[PDB]
Design an enzyme around this catalytic site. Structure first.
Site: not given
Ligand SMILES: [Ca+2]
Ligand SMILES: [Ca+2]
Ligand SMILES: [Ca+2]
Ligand SMILES: [Ca+2]
Ligand SMILES: [Ca+2]
Ligand SMILES: [Ca+2]
Ligand SMILES: [Ca+2]
Ligand SMILES: [Ca+2]
Ligand SMILES: [Ca+2]
Ligand SMILES: [Ca+2]
Lengths: 645, 645
Positions: A129, A154, A156, A167, A175, A178, A335, A338, A396, A455, A457, A627
């Site tokens: 906007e 992530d 690419e 980097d 790319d 995102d 373990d 996550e 958890e 743990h 769990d 586990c």
């Molecule tokens: Ca867990």
């Molecule tokens: Ca990326």
């Molecule tokens: Ca990059």
């Molecule tokens: Ca992506």
């Protein structure tokens, strides 16, 4: 935004007017000695007010009218629209001595009107906007506004062992999907007046927080330039005439952490050139605020997507097996890992949290769970040593809950700990600080340190009871096991024997009688039951749970040399939860009616609800099926930016 | 606060009930196998409810009434008042098989009712109220509540070169006057049941933040014990029967800073003894929150108290002279020192801020401005090098102001800086972080780096104009000096000469003409006037000032080899302000009517108001009279805890 401008004695001052600002102009200092009066003339698109101590008289284009000279009497100059040319907008003031009607000297202001706005999406609809007033601030709440920025966790391009934020270079074109868009919008003449340039800049402190790329030569030879980021504090922008827009993409390098609130800022500034060996002057500055999206865990009440398992020995969603070389003798995929997600408006993807534990599978996430639209993060302690509580079976998260008027829509992160006065084990400070700094899920510390593994769990789990809601927190109970066993004993089954198959089996005969007749054991499990009840109190308190919300599953523990609990028979709160349909470990309890009484008991508990129980064989390692497995889940429909933590 | 309690099979469980809590009691697990029913009996001061899935039936002392046994059916036990004895409050449940009216087995709960509350003053009236609900939280605002803690920056005993917070030892009895009281209040039997003890504790993180002392053997041999603080995480409290109170005194060691919000917490906990090599269990915990009072600067509009000066060459308040050995060749008492104050309810005193600059007088504050009811603080950079902008002539504070609906009652701290893109000088990060972390006065950065010395006090000052308010920000103007000089030139005085006395004097003849006829000079001062106008814009913006609130004093600057400004004639915004009655430097301007035109000009400006001008001789060093003096001031009547920053 009022800016100070002064005329120069007998001289014409050239200046750049930025729209959205007003000029306070001093005509008194430029007045020749002896001049008792002043008249003014001005262009059409320039508005001029004569202000004497707060009273402003708007004046025409050709004045032919004189005012008495005075420090209190000054000018207020405003401009409605951008300039077609560097000039033709001006204000010229003539000075008069009282002895004549002809001006003695005169001063002037040549105005060049430009419009500079650094724009982001502060209303979070997915488009940018024009000049949102709230773009320079960040507000929580549904009616709140601010720009949101994703970290690139992530990858690419598979050719490198790193996340994309690692980097300053951008390779693939996807790319940018995102990244969050930031557009510099401009209105003005064919070029800028001499001695003026526009510069984008960020803090040295924000160097490792963000990065900003510009895409040049689209299609064709298309190239990605890194304008802002690590080692680049500023970039000089090329001004283009008329209405022009410069599109930039911003990427979060770092997650909200200790010492980092998650907030970052990018500035644009109009610099006037003064002289050599002298700093350029920030005539005008615009600012946008991004907040880096936190990392959010998924509870067991959310719809499942993928199920993960190490390998090996021996429904309506897939299964990803971790083989051999990836395993490296590490049987716990729970373990080390996550699952979580990150989200922006119309942008987001799963992100994985890798444990500091660094088991033999430590290599696995990056090599690779990591790829397009799949994120990776780690916290590795420097000065602190890792313990068993840093495993993610100790990490958890609760279902959405309401505690005394306060809403926790994304749930609450539950991590095991020890009493502060104990001096026992605890999760590393880096991870705790990380989860805490995510702050949307407001972490809580239960007491797991009465357990050998330590743990969360082990003693608790959550399962959906398809209202769909209310999630029925399931806790382990030694008391329930002793009660059930006493009932079976009174039924004549006290001679029935646990652990059919396996060993001894009946060679070493462990019977309901001999178990109930064990003193040290029942004392140990009384203590363990206390340990369970303390956590019960914590959960009820902090999660806003009643006693109606809890189901006690029969369980039995044994005290080791550390005065800690290890499962007597496989722990049944250690199960995995997919959309009802429970993954409960096979207890291998005693046989009544040619059936395990424990299985029939927990069925008798859960089966009246939508839950469908299924029992898995495993325990000397030691852990049950939590586990051994980890499940990726579908995120909340609730957008985190609508909270008020 | 609901706590879980379970009966034991065929056994009587002893427990400690803490008032303000309720017990959820499980009678199902303790039931013998085959018992279809249960009846209950209980003491008078124990309230018992039978809860079946949310419906609670309050029951009499002698039941003679049976309920059907069930996991859903449970007990709710409450106690109104503390116990006279460890027992005589009990709940005994009898179990029945359906084949007889005589109980088979029975279980019991022996209750010992105690009342434990850790109390502080959260309503800020200066006394300690009993169990304030808000004591565990800290809220800003007049209707807000929280406990306030002073740092001890002062020194009771002259024998040591340190503030009182610097050690774990307390010597003088007056020390405790600055400390905040915390009282542990208790109601119970003559002693505690076996295996129970009360413990006070704080975080390892709060070790260097606070300290807690207990005074034993009052009068007599009276001793001060350090219960909590550096190297002491916990202290075991001795329980005394009946109604009892334990008085403690708390002292802040550290000021709010980077990484420290100013908030600290102290916990009390009831620990139950389990067994050897096993941690004590936190049956009950109470918590109080202290916030350490910030450090607050005093502007020039507040009533003065003491005036300080170095030595030497050569009204209605005192003067403290710094001699010789203390001087050590350092003539600036302004740059090394900033006066401030700290306050709690019915507690507080002046605190001094010592500059990292470390001039030859660096020794002076501690040795000593530091003493009873006088504080001391410092921030010394480790990795960063000190510059001229870390001097406290660069550190000032604004009068109370209102910026777009937001109130700044204690004013706003003003510090000089450079453009972010300049790469020039700036105040050390430690001091900036300190002032920022005080956060009540919300610091702002002006631009001082166009000046050789680089101080804020050069281009601006504030003086009261006894409305009493509105404070008339005074700024330097080269434009006003050139205007005045041109007027005097046109009056025939252009041959009048600056710097009467001194030198050349008239041997080198510097006249209004030759000054106005200087090109490079007028260009330099045009640039300098721009530098002034930028700051003018900043002040008007951030302080919510109009053009009505500013007075431009005639000033002249000269550009050095660094392209920075040094005073052409002594800087007149460099003055000192006591209750009107200005301390303005003697400008030594040209003579008209046997009078300096500059003096008469600034008189003509200020004298129409209540201000009475007085001119002091000084300039090659270089600084005027601010740099040579520092004034201690009377604090605000506004209490900082009534803000909402
Ligand atoms: Ca867990
Ligand atoms: Ca990326
Ligand atoms: Ca990059
Ligand atoms: Ca992506
Ligand atoms: Ca790892
Ligand atoms: Ca002390
Ligand atoms: Ca003291
Ligand atoms: Ca010092
Ligand atoms: Ca004192
Ligand atoms: Ca100062």
């Amino acid at each position: 935004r009022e800016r100070t401008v002064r005329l120069q004695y007998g001289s014409r001052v050239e200046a750049v007017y930025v729209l959205g600002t007003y000029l306070w102009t001093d005509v008194y200092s430029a007045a020749p000695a002896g001049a008792q009066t002043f008249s003014l003339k001005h262009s059409e698109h320039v508005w001029v007010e004569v202000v004497r101590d707060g009273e402003a008289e708007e004046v025409a284009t050709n004045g032919k009218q004189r005012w008495l000279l005075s420090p209190s009497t000054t000018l207020r100059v405003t401009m409605s629209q951008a300039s077609t040319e560097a000039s033709s907008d001006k204000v010229t003031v003539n000075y008069y001595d009282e002895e004549g009607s002809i001006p003695i000297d005169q001063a002037g202001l040549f105005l060049t009107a430009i419009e500079i706005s650094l724009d982001v999406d502060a209303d979070r609809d997915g488009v940018v906007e024009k000049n949102n007033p709230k773009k320079a601030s960040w507000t929580w709440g549904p009616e709140g506004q601010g720009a949101i920025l994703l970290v690139n966790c992530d990858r690419e391009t598979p050719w490198l062992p790193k996340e994309d934020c690692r980097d300053e270079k951008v390779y693939s074109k996807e790319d940018l999907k995102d990244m969050s868009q930031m557009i510099l919008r401009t209105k003005g003449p064919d070029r800028l007046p001499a001695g003026y340039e526009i510069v984008l800049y960020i803090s040295m402190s924000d160097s490792d927080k963000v990065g900003v790329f510009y895409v040049e030569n689209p299609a064709a030879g298309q190239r990605y330039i890194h304008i802002l980021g690590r080692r680049k504090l500023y970039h000089v922008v090329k001004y283009t005439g008329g209405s022009a827009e410069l599109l930039f993409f911003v990427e979060g390098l770092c997650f909200p952490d200790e010492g980092f609130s998650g907030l970052v800022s990018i500035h644009v500034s109009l610099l006037e050139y003064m002289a050599q060996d002298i700093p350029l002057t920030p005539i005008f500055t615009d600012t946008v605020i991004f907040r880096i999206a936190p990392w959010i865990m998924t509870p067991n009440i959310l719809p499942p997507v993928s199920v993960f398992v190490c390998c090996m020995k021996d429904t309506n969603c897939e299964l990803k097996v971790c083989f051999q070389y990836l395993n490296r003798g590490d049987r716990w995929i729970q373990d080390e890992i996550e699952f979580g997600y990150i989200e922006a408006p119309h942008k987001g993807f799963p992100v994985v949290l890798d444990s500091p534990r660094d088991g033999n599978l430590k290599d696995f996430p990056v090599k690779e769970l990591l790829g397009p639209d799949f994120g990776y993060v780690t916290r590795e302690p420097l000065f602190e040593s890792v313990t068993s509580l840093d495993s993610f079976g100790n990490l958890e998260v609760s279902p959405p809950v309401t505690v005394n008027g306060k809403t926790y829509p994304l749930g609450r992160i539950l991590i095991g700990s020890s009493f502060p006065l104990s001096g026992g084990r605890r999760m590393t400070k880096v991870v705790r600080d990380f989860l805490k700094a995510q702050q949307v899920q407001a972490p809580v510390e239960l007491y797991s340190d009465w357990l050998t593994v330590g743990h969360v769990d082990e003693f608790m789990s959550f399962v959906p009871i398809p209202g769909t809601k209310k999630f029925l927190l399931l806790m382990a109970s030694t008391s329930a096991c002793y009660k059930l066993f006493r009932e079976k004993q009174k039924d004549g089954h006290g001679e029935a024997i646990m652990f059919k198959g396996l060993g001894g089996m009946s060679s070493k005969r462990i019977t309901i009688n001999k178990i109930l007749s064990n003193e040290s054991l029942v004392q140990e499990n009384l203590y363990f039951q206390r340990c369970l009840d303390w956590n019960r109190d914590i959960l009820k308190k902090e999660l806003g749970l009643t006693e109606q919300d809890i189901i006690d599953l029969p369980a039995l523990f044994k005290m080791d040399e550390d005065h800690r609990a290890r499962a007597f028979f496989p722990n049944m709160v250690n199960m995995i939860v997919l959309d009802k349909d429970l993954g409960i470990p096979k207890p291998f309890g005693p046989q009544v009616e040619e059936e395990c009484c424990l299985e029939m008991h927990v069925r008798g508990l859960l089966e009246p609800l939508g839950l469908e129980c299924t029992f898995i064989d495993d325990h000397k390692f030691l852990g049950e099926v939590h586990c051994g497995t980890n499940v990726r889940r579908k995120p909340f429909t609730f957008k985190w930016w609508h909270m008020v933590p």
